[PDB]
Coordinates of C-alpha atoms and ligand atoms in Angstrom, one line a residue:
Chain A
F1 CA 0.0 0.0 0.0
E2 CA 1.0 3.6 -0.7
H3 CA 0.8 6.4 1.9
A4 CA 1.7 10.1 1.6
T5 CA 3.2 12.3 4.3
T6 CA 5.1 15.6 4.8
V7 CA 8.2 15.7 7.0
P8 CA 10.4 18.6 8.2
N9 CA 13.9 18.8 6.8
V10 CA 15.9 18.1 10.0
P11 CA 18.1 15.3 11.4
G12 CA 17.3 13.2 14.5
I13 CA 13.6 14.0 14.3
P14 CA 11.6 10.7 14.0
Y15 CA 8.1 11.2 12.6
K16 CA 5.4 8.7 13.3
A17 CA 2.3 7.9 11.2
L18 CA -0.4 5.3 10.6
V19 CA -2.0 3.7 7.6
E20 CA -5.8 3.0 7.7
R21 CA -7.0 -0.1 5.8
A22 CA -10.3 -1.9 6.5
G23 CA -9.7 -5.2 8.3
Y24 CA -6.0 -4.4 8.9
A25 CA -4.7 -3.2 12.2
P26 CA -3.2 0.3 11.8
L27 CA 0.5 -0.1 11.1
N28 CA 3.0 2.1 12.9
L29 CA 5.4 3.8 10.5
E30 CA 8.5 5.6 11.7
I31 CA 10.5 7.8 9.3
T32 CA 13.9 9.3 10.2
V33 CA 16.0 11.7 8.0
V34 CA 19.4 10.5 9.0
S35 CA 21.2 13.3 7.3
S36 CA 21.2 15.7 4.3
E37 CA 23.5 16.0 1.3
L38 CA 23.2 19.1 -0.9
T39 CA 25.5 18.5 -3.9
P40 CA 25.6 21.2 -6.6
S41 CA 27.0 21.2 -10.1
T42 CA 30.2 23.2 -10.5
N43 CA 32.9 23.8 -13.2
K44 CA 36.6 24.5 -12.8
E45 CA 37.5 28.0 -14.0
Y46 CA 41.1 28.5 -13.1
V47 CA 43.7 28.4 -10.4
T48 CA 45.8 31.0 -8.6
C49 CA 48.7 31.1 -6.1
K50 CA 51.7 33.1 -5.0
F51 CA 54.0 33.6 -8.0
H52 CA 57.7 34.3 -8.5
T53 CA 59.3 36.8 -10.9
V54 CA 61.9 35.6 -13.4
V55 CA 65.2 37.5 -13.4
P56 CA 67.2 35.8 -16.3
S57 CA 70.7 36.8 -17.3
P58 CA 70.5 40.0 -19.3
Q59 CA 71.8 40.3 -22.8
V60 CA 74.8 42.6 -23.4
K61 CA 75.8 43.8 -26.9
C62 CA 79.1 45.5 -26.7
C63 CA 79.8 48.7 -28.6
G64 CA 77.0 47.9 -31.0
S65 CA 73.2 47.7 -31.4
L66 CA 70.4 45.4 -30.5
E67 CA 66.6 45.3 -30.6
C68 CA 63.9 44.0 -28.1
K69 CA 61.9 40.9 -28.8
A70 CA 58.8 39.7 -27.0
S71 CA 58.3 36.3 -25.5
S72 CA 55.3 33.9 -25.2
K73 CA 55.8 33.7 -21.4
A74 CA 52.9 35.1 -19.4
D75 CA 53.2 38.7 -18.1
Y76 CA 56.4 39.1 -20.1
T77 CA 58.3 42.4 -20.2
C78 CA 61.3 43.5 -22.3
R79 CA 63.3 46.7 -22.8
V80 CA 66.6 47.9 -24.1
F81 CA 69.0 50.4 -22.6
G82 CA 72.0 52.2 -24.2
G83 CA 75.0 53.8 -22.5
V84 CA 75.2 50.9 -20.1
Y85 CA 77.8 50.8 -17.3
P86 CA 78.8 47.1 -17.0
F87 CA 81.0 46.1 -14.1
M88 CA 81.6 42.9 -12.2
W89 CA 84.1 41.3 -9.8
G90 CA 86.0 40.4 -12.9
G91 CA 85.7 44.0 -14.0
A92 CA 84.4 45.9 -17.0
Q93 CA 82.7 43.0 -18.9
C94 CA 83.5 44.5 -22.3
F95 CA 85.1 47.7 -23.5
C96 CA 84.0 50.6 -25.6
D97 CA 83.7 54.3 -24.7
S98 CA 80.1 54.0 -23.3
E99 CA 78.9 52.7 -26.7
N100 CA 77.7 49.4 -25.4
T101 CA 74.0 48.6 -24.7
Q102 CA 72.1 45.9 -22.8
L103 CA 68.7 44.3 -23.3
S104 CA 66.8 43.2 -20.2
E105 CA 63.6 41.2 -19.8
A106 CA 61.6 39.3 -17.2
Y107 CA 58.5 37.2 -16.7
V108 CA 56.6 35.3 -14.0
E109 CA 55.9 31.7 -13.0
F110 CA 54.1 29.9 -10.2
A111 CA 56.5 28.9 -7.4
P112 CA 57.0 25.3 -6.4
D113 CA 55.1 25.8 -3.1
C114 CA 52.1 26.6 -5.3
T115 CA 51.8 22.9 -6.0
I116 CA 50.1 22.6 -2.6
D117 CA 49.1 26.2 -2.0
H118 CA 46.9 26.3 -5.1
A119 CA 43.5 28.0 -4.8
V120 CA 40.8 27.1 -7.4
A121 CA 38.0 29.4 -8.5
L122 CA 34.8 27.6 -9.0
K123 CA 31.5 28.4 -10.8
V124 CA 28.5 26.5 -9.4
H125 CA 24.8 26.1 -10.2
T126 CA 21.8 23.8 -9.9
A127 CA 22.1 22.7 -6.3
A128 CA 20.9 19.1 -5.9
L129 CA 19.8 17.6 -2.5
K130 CA 20.3 14.0 -1.4
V131 CA 18.3 12.6 1.5
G132 CA 18.9 9.4 3.5
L133 CA 15.7 7.9 5.0
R134 CA 15.3 5.1 7.5
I135 CA 11.8 3.6 7.8
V136 CA 10.6 1.3 10.5
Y137 CA 7.4 -0.7 9.9
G138 CA 6.2 -3.8 11.8
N139 CA 9.3 -3.7 13.9
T140 CA 11.3 -4.1 10.7
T141 CA 13.8 -1.5 9.6
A142 CA 14.5 -0.6 6.0
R143 CA 16.7 2.1 4.5
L144 CA 17.0 4.2 1.3
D145 CA 19.0 7.1 -0.1
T146 CA 17.3 9.2 -2.8
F147 CA 17.7 12.4 -4.7
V148 CA 15.3 15.0 -3.4
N149 CA 13.6 15.0 -6.8
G150 CA 10.1 13.5 -6.9
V151 CA 10.7 11.5 -10.1
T152 CA 13.6 9.1 -9.2
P153 CA 12.6 6.5 -6.6
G154 CA 15.6 4.7 -5.0
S155 CA 16.4 1.0 -4.8
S156 CA 16.2 -0.8 -1.4
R157 CA 14.9 -4.4 -1.4
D158 CA 13.8 -3.4 -4.9
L159 CA 11.4 -1.0 -3.2
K160 CA 10.5 2.3 -5.0
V161 CA 10.3 5.2 -2.6
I162 CA 10.0 8.9 -3.7
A163 CA 10.5 12.2 -1.9
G164 CA 10.3 15.9 -2.6
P165 CA 10.5 18.2 -4.3
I166 CA 11.3 20.7 -1.5
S167 CA 8.8 23.3 -0.5
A168 CA 11.5 26.0 -0.9
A169 CA 14.9 26.0 -2.5
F170 CA 17.9 26.8 -0.2
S171 CA 21.6 26.9 -1.1
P172 CA 24.4 28.7 0.9
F173 CA 26.6 28.5 -2.2
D174 CA 26.8 31.5 -4.6
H175 CA 27.5 31.6 -8.3
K176 CA 31.1 32.3 -7.7
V177 CA 33.3 30.6 -5.0
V178 CA 36.9 29.7 -4.3
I179 CA 38.5 26.8 -2.6
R180 CA 41.9 26.9 -0.8
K181 CA 43.5 24.5 1.5
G182 CA 40.2 22.9 2.4
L183 CA 38.5 26.2 3.1
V184 CA 35.7 27.5 0.9
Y185 CA 35.2 31.3 0.5
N186 CA 32.3 33.1 -1.1
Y187 CA 33.7 35.8 -3.5
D188 CA 33.1 37.1 -7.0
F189 CA 36.4 36.1 -8.6
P190 CA 37.5 38.0 -11.7
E191 CA 36.6 36.2 -14.9
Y192 CA 39.3 34.2 -16.7
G193 CA 41.5 36.3 -19.0
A194 CA 41.0 39.4 -16.8
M195 CA 44.2 40.6 -15.1
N196 CA 44.0 43.3 -12.5
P197 CA 47.2 44.0 -10.5
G198 CA 46.8 44.0 -6.7
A199 CA 43.7 41.8 -6.7
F200 CA 42.6 38.2 -6.2
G201 CA 43.4 35.8 -9.0
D202 CA 46.1 38.0 -10.5
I203 CA 47.8 34.8 -11.9
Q204 CA 45.4 32.5 -13.7
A205 CA 45.9 29.1 -15.4
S206 CA 43.7 26.4 -16.8
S207 CA 45.6 23.8 -14.8
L208 CA 48.2 23.7 -12.1
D209 CA 50.9 22.4 -14.4
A210 CA 49.8 24.2 -17.6
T211 CA 52.7 25.4 -19.7
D212 CA 50.5 28.1 -21.2
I213 CA 49.7 30.9 -18.8
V214 CA 48.3 34.4 -18.9
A215 CA 48.9 37.2 -16.4
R216 CA 49.5 40.9 -16.0
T217 CA 50.9 42.5 -12.8
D218 CA 52.4 45.8 -14.0
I219 CA 56.1 45.0 -14.2
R220 CA 58.2 48.0 -15.3
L221 CA 62.0 47.8 -16.0
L222 CA 64.4 50.3 -14.4
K223 CA 67.5 51.6 -16.2
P224 CA 70.9 50.4 -15.0
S225 CA 72.0 52.8 -12.3
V226 CA 75.1 51.4 -10.6
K227 CA 78.6 50.2 -11.3
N228 CA 77.9 46.5 -11.7
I229 CA 75.5 44.7 -14.0
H230 CA 72.1 44.6 -12.4
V231 CA 68.4 44.5 -13.4
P232 CA 66.2 46.6 -11.1
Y233 CA 62.6 45.4 -11.4
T234 CA 59.6 47.1 -9.9
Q235 CA 56.3 45.3 -9.5
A236 CA 53.1 45.4 -7.4
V237 CA 52.7 43.1 -4.4
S238 CA 51.3 39.7 -5.2
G239 CA 47.5 39.6 -5.0
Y240 CA 47.3 36.1 -3.5
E241 CA 48.9 37.1 -0.2
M242 CA 46.7 40.3 -0.4
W243 CA 43.5 38.3 -0.6
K244 CA 44.9 36.0 2.1
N245 CA 45.5 38.8 4.6
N246 CA 41.9 40.2 4.5
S247 CA 40.0 37.3 2.9
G248 CA 37.3 37.7 5.6
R249 CA 35.8 34.9 7.7
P250 CA 35.2 31.5 6.1
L251 CA 31.8 30.2 5.0
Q252 CA 31.8 27.7 7.8
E253 CA 31.0 30.6 10.1
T254 CA 28.4 32.1 7.8
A255 CA 26.3 29.3 6.4
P256 CA 22.6 29.5 7.5
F257 CA 21.2 26.5 9.3
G258 CA 24.7 25.4 10.2
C259 CA 25.4 23.6 7.0
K260 CA 28.4 21.2 7.4
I261 CA 30.4 21.8 4.2
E262 CA 32.9 19.3 2.8
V263 CA 35.4 20.2 0.2
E264 CA 36.2 17.0 -1.9
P265 CA 32.6 17.0 -3.3
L266 CA 32.3 20.7 -2.6
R267 CA 28.9 19.9 -1.0
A268 CA 26.9 20.6 2.1
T269 CA 25.6 18.0 4.5
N270 CA 23.6 17.8 7.8
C271 CA 21.9 21.1 7.0
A272 CA 18.2 21.5 8.0
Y273 CA 15.6 23.7 6.3
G274 CA 12.3 23.2 4.6
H275 CA 9.6 20.6 4.2
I276 CA 9.6 17.4 2.1
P277 CA 6.5 15.5 0.8
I278 CA 7.1 11.8 0.4
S279 CA 5.2 8.7 -0.7
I280 CA 6.0 5.3 0.9
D281 CA 5.0 2.0 -0.6
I282 CA 4.6 -0.9 1.8
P283 CA 4.0 -4.6 0.8
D284 CA 0.6 -5.9 1.6
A285 CA 2.2 -9.0 3.3
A286 CA 3.7 -6.6 5.9
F287 CA 0.1 -5.8 7.0
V288 CA -1.7 -7.9 9.6
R289 CA -5.4 -8.6 9.6
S290 CA -7.4 -7.3 12.5
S291 CA -8.7 -10.8 13.2
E292 CA -5.4 -11.9 14.8
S293 CA -4.8 -8.4 16.3
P294 CA -5.4 -8.1 20.1
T295 CA -8.8 -6.8 21.0
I296 CA -9.1 -4.0 23.6
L297 CA -12.1 -2.8 25.6
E298 CA -13.0 0.1 27.8
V299 CA -9.7 2.1 27.7
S300 CA -9.2 5.4 29.5
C301 CA -6.4 8.0 29.8
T302 CA -4.9 9.9 32.7
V303 CA -2.3 12.7 32.6
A304 CA -0.3 12.0 35.8
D305 CA 1.7 15.2 35.2
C306 CA 3.0 17.2 32.3
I307 CA 5.5 20.0 31.8
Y308 CA 5.7 22.4 28.9
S309 CA 9.3 21.4 28.2
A310 CA 11.2 21.9 25.0
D311 CA 12.6 18.4 25.4
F312 CA 10.6 15.2 25.7
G313 CA 9.4 15.4 29.3
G314 CA 5.7 14.7 29.1
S315 CA 4.2 11.7 30.8
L316 CA 0.9 9.9 30.3
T317 CA -0.9 6.7 31.5
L318 CA -3.6 4.5 30.0
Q319 CA -5.8 1.7 31.5
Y320 CA -7.3 -0.9 29.3
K321 CA -9.5 -4.0 29.3
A322 CA -8.8 -6.7 26.8
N323 CA -9.3 -10.4 26.0
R324 CA -6.3 -11.4 24.0
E325 CA -2.5 -11.3 24.7
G326 CA -0.1 -9.8 22.3
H327 CA 1.1 -6.4 21.1
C328 CA -0.7 -3.3 19.8
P329 CA 0.5 0.0 18.5
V330 CA -0.1 3.4 20.1
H331 CA -0.5 6.7 18.2
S332 CA -1.6 10.3 18.6
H333 CA -3.4 11.9 15.6
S334 CA -2.9 15.4 17.2
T335 CA 0.1 16.9 15.6
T336 CA 0.8 19.2 18.6
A337 CA 1.9 16.1 20.6
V338 CA 4.3 13.3 19.7
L339 CA 4.8 9.9 21.4
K340 CA 8.0 8.0 22.1
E341 CA 7.2 4.3 21.7
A342 CA 4.9 3.0 19.0
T343 CA 3.7 -0.3 20.3
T344 CA 3.5 -2.3 23.6
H345 CA 2.2 -5.5 25.1
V346 CA -1.5 -5.9 26.0
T347 CA -3.0 -7.8 28.9
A348 CA -6.6 -8.6 29.9
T349 CA -6.8 -5.6 32.3
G350 CA -3.4 -4.0 32.3
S351 CA -2.4 -0.4 32.4
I352 CA 0.8 1.1 31.0
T353 CA 2.5 4.5 31.0
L354 CA 3.8 6.5 28.0
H355 CA 6.4 9.2 27.4
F356 CA 5.6 12.0 24.9
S357 CA 6.2 15.7 24.1
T358 CA 4.1 18.7 23.1
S359 CA 4.5 22.1 21.6
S360 CA 1.6 23.7 23.5
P361 CA 0.7 24.1 27.2
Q362 CA -2.9 23.0 26.6
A363 CA -2.3 19.3 26.6
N364 CA -5.7 18.3 25.2
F365 CA -5.8 15.8 22.4
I366 CA -6.9 12.4 21.1
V367 CA -4.7 9.3 21.3
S368 CA -5.3 5.8 20.0
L369 CA -4.4 2.6 21.9
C370 CA -4.2 -0.3 19.5
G371 CA -7.1 0.4 17.1
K372 CA -9.4 2.3 19.5
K373 CA -9.3 6.1 20.1
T374 CA -9.7 8.1 23.3
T375 CA -9.7 11.8 24.3
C376 CA -7.3 13.0 27.0
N377 CA -6.7 16.5 28.4
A378 CA -4.5 18.3 30.9
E379 CA -2.4 21.5 31.4
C380 CA 1.4 21.8 31.3
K381 CA 3.8 24.2 33.0
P382 CA 6.9 26.0 31.7
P383 CA 10.2 24.4 32.9
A384 CA 12.8 25.9 35.2
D385 CA 15.6 25.3 32.7
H386 CA 15.0 27.3 29.5
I387 CA 18.1 26.7 27.3
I388 CA 18.8 23.3 25.7
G389 CA 20.1 22.2 22.3
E390 CA 18.4 18.8 22.2
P391 CA 15.6 18.2 19.7
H392 CA 12.9 20.9 20.2
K393 CA 9.6 21.7 18.6
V394 CA 9.0 18.3 17.0
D395 CA 5.8 20.1 15.9
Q396 CA 6.0 23.9 15.3
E397 CA 3.6 26.1 17.3
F398 CA 0.2 26.6 15.8
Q399 CA -1.0 29.7 17.8
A400 CA -2.3 27.1 20.3
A401 CA -0.3 28.6 23.2
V402 CA -3.6 30.3 24.1
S403 CA -5.1 28.7 27.2
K404 CA -8.6 27.4 27.9
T405 CA -8.8 29.9 30.7
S406 CA -7.8 32.6 28.2
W407 CA -10.6 31.5 25.9
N408 CA -13.1 31.6 28.8
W409 CA -11.9 35.1 29.7
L410 CA -12.0 36.4 26.1
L411 CA -15.5 35.0 25.6
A412 CA -16.6 36.7 28.9
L413 CA -15.0 39.9 27.7
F414 CA -16.7 40.4 24.3
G415 CA -20.2 41.7 24.8
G416 CA -23.4 41.3 22.8
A417 CA -24.0 44.9 22.0
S418 CA -25.5 43.9 18.6
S419 CA -28.5 42.4 20.4
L420 CA -28.8 45.5 22.6
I421 CA -29.0 47.8 19.5
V422 CA -31.4 45.4 17.7
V423 CA -33.7 45.4 20.7
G424 CA -33.4 49.2 21.0
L425 CA -34.4 49.7 17.4
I426 CA -37.3 47.3 17.7
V427 CA -38.7 49.0 20.8
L428 CA -38.0 52.4 19.0
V429 CA -40.1 51.5 16.0
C430 CA -42.9 50.1 18.3
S431 CA -43.0 53.3 20.2
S432 CA -42.9 55.4 17.0
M433 CA -46.0 53.5 15.8
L434 CA -47.7 53.9 19.2
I435 CA -47.2 57.6 19.0
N436 CA -48.3 57.8 15.4
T437 CA -51.5 56.6 16.9
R438 CA -51.7 59.9 18.8
Chain B
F1 CA 17.8 20.3 41.2
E2 CA 17.5 23.3 43.5
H3 CA 14.7 23.9 46.0
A4 CA 14.1 26.8 48.4
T5 CA 12.6 26.6 51.9
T6 CA 12.4 28.5 55.1
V7 CA 13.1 26.7 58.5
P8 CA 12.7 27.9 62.1
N9 CA 15.8 28.4 64.1
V10 CA 15.5 25.5 66.6
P11 CA 17.2 22.2 67.4
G12 CA 15.5 18.8 67.2
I13 CA 12.7 20.0 64.9
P14 CA 12.9 18.1 61.6
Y15 CA 11.2 19.8 58.7
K16 CA 9.8 17.8 55.7
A17 CA 9.4 19.0 52.2
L18 CA 8.8 17.8 48.6
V19 CA 10.2 18.6 45.2
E20 CA 7.9 18.6 42.2
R21 CA 9.4 17.6 38.8
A22 CA 7.5 16.3 35.8
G23 CA 8.0 12.6 35.4
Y24 CA 9.8 12.2 38.7
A25 CA 8.2 10.9 41.9
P26 CA 8.1 13.6 44.6
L27 CA 11.2 13.2 46.7
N28 CA 10.9 13.4 50.5
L29 CA 13.4 15.9 51.9
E30 CA 14.1 16.0 55.7
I31 CA 16.1 18.9 57.1
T32 CA 17.3 19.0 60.7
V33 CA 19.2 21.9 62.4
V34 CA 21.4 19.8 64.7
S35 CA 22.7 22.8 66.7
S36 CA 23.5 26.5 66.5
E37 CA 26.9 28.2 66.9
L38 CA 26.9 32.0 67.3
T39 CA 30.6 33.1 67.2
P40 CA 31.3 36.9 67.4
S41 CA 34.5 38.8 66.8
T42 CA 36.2 40.1 70.0
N43 CA 39.4 41.9 70.9
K44 CA 41.4 41.6 74.1
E45 CA 41.5 44.9 76.0
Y46 CA 43.3 44.2 79.3
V47 CA 43.3 42.0 82.4
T48 CA 42.6 42.6 86.1
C49 CA 43.0 40.6 89.4
Ligands
LIG1 C1 6.6 -7.4 15.5 O1 5.4 -7.2 16.2 C2 4.5 -8.3 16.1 C3 3.2 -7.9 16.8 O2 3.0 -8.7 18.0 C4 5.2 -9.6 16.7 O3 4.3 -10.7 16.5 C5 6.5 -9.8 16.0 O4 7.1 -11.0 16.6 C6 7.4 -8.6 16.1 N1 8.6 -8.8 15.3 C7 9.8 -8.8 15.9 C8 11.0 -9.1 15.0 O5 10.0 -8.6 17.1

């Protein structure tokens, strides 16, 4: 049989339900969302890391001429200079009365440390959510893991179970992101082929070990200015360390709902938000006919004591009369309250307690023992402790915090002035006629 | 758990109380003031004889 139900997106929050079929005892169904797995689609754009300038041996043409030539190396620079003043420990490298000239050039390349200090700029889209569900029926536990989509049931025992789509779409990830040393940072990285000195991603490459590179970081050559042969180079500070210094806090400290983000899939997990509708198919053989089910008689409830606690602290008791030994389930069709155990033994005239929780102080509702129903009411008090991180609000508040006494007072407050005005008008018209008599 | 109660100053007078907690049986609490000890601060002034 197939049953439909909506569940909150949250871990460690079992949800209990029942299936009604004529001649079959209502079957307890427990559903647990073990964890969440939001995996988006992303594409590798480029990589960046601290670089190193190249300072190759300059070219010296003595007492003659020469011309500059470009080079395919990324961020390359070249420039000639006449009237050079070459000196070295060995002395004047060559000789002519200041006629000689020298060509200098430089370029950049990623340093060896980059191999492990690389930071990759990622473009992401189409967040996809994966949900793992564990379902208990007839004290039998089955499992499945399915994409949140409502069109691809998973495989578990060759059982087709579907979930979603989500009520709302949530994704902490933004279109542009960066990954560095296992830390993910939300930032609008410059597009590939865009070089801006003193900025993130100044050096860009298709792959870490790509021979072809493109970069621009405003390198300007300086004229020789000293005795010896030297190439003074002026360049802006590397942008990688710049972004490192003031990169801001990591996404791990900014993700809403406490998403637990992992890097190797670049995906979130254990993050709770939204609702999920699901349809569960259960084999008919799993069901049990009511003929063999225990029969109960003259059952009654009693709230020994309840507390309006965030955690599961509510208690209840039931007393029953029966004729057959065995087990029956227990349920509460009121969403405001949730039980703890789904089934229990049954005796001829036994009475058993129950643990439960509620989201309202007016503990009035209907609970079913085995197949039969029964009303049960009480009032609950706020707790002394008022800060706890354990599961809370298994059912969200439904403006039911208002008390029965509050309803009685509000009813006694509003007055029936409409009846007063109606009676006044009626007597007024009657008197008007009586005086039209004259 | 913490509970507040007022007791008379007197020996050999047990006082009984209960603590109410949801889902917990009320726990009997007996309190006895075995004795009193009023100790003041004093300073030696001098001696005579
Ligand atoms: C499940 O509950 C039924 C109901 O009494 C019982 O007969 C059966 O033995 C239970 N299964 C297990 C594995 O305990």
